[PDB]
């Protein structure tokens, strides 16, 4: 059973889980009892916020590349059916094409992660925001804590 | 018309929606633009050497859903565990599937009105992997040593 699975706070990528039990990762990210999932709205209330905290990582994932950009979320702009970015990272976003958002956080083998995926229709993400980490290690006190105040927000 | 004679009269637009105006592939229109140099994959570490010297250039993952592009200079990688590493530089990192590169094409056309050169990185299925596109100015205009070491790199290719 996924549900039951995941309240065992399996370690390992959700996207393993996901191919298991062979649904999407929206569901899995569905069935882990703390995560809160929106609708695609919010996407500007998610993404504005997340502008507003510091140094955070974005990855986009292909079955040929993995990148990462390090660094402050660009703001947005919306025009010809596109969310258009304004430093290092820019480009276009189908925000349109975002049916879900979840902000998720858990453990790696007792180490706190803290993410925001944008989910499409197919139940994949398009995008994936990490929180940054602290020198030490750590996950940035001020960003889990924005993080939280949103999450509670988006419930509200 | 033929893709090739399509090509050539210097279409307006992207040339992935050419591709599917012709029902072929990204590969297929590249291989058919005027002066466009392909090579095998077996050319990657070459390309991907060569351009990390060139300074700031735009690299972009192209997706359903996204187009991600990250400027700056092309971070320089390591063949290991299967992947293409990269040497995490300014914000930009990750990993690259070196060994599904099958293709490698150095590109020039205009677009937009523009004048653009490019790189693009294919898998087998014709699609594009990766992109790099060369510099601008703070005046909207293509970096000119690079162009010219493109143009050495596109010569040396070919």
């Given amino acids: 059973s996924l549900q039951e699975f995941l309240k065992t706070e399996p ?3 959700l996207e393993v889980v996901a191919e298991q039990y062979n649904t999407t990762l929206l569901e899995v990210v569905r069935n882990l009892p703390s995560s809160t999932v929106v ?3 919010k996407f500007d209330t998610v993404w504005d916020t997340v502008c507003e905290w510091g140094n955070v990582t974005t990855l986009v ?3 040929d590349v993995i990148l990462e950009f ?5 703001s947005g702009f919306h025009r010809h059916g596109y969310f258009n970015l304004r430093h290092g990272m820019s480009g276009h976003i189908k925000a349109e ?3 879900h958002i979840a902000l998720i956080e858990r453990k790696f083998m007792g180490m706190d992660t803290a ?3 944008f989910f499409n229709k197919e139940g994949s993400a398009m995008l994936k925001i990490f929180l940054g980490r ?4 750590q996950l940035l006190s001020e960003q889990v804590s924005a993080f939280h105040t949103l999450a509670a927000s988006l419930k509200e």
């Fill in 97 to 99: 094409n975002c049916t």
């Fill in 70 to 74: 390090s660094g402050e979320l660009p």
């Fill in 134 to 137: 602290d020198d030490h290690r």
């Fill in 61 to 63: 994932h292909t079955a």
């Fill in 39 to 41: 609708p695609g709205d």
């Fill in 115 to 117: 993410s925001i995926l």
């Fill in 11 to 13: 370690d390992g990528t």
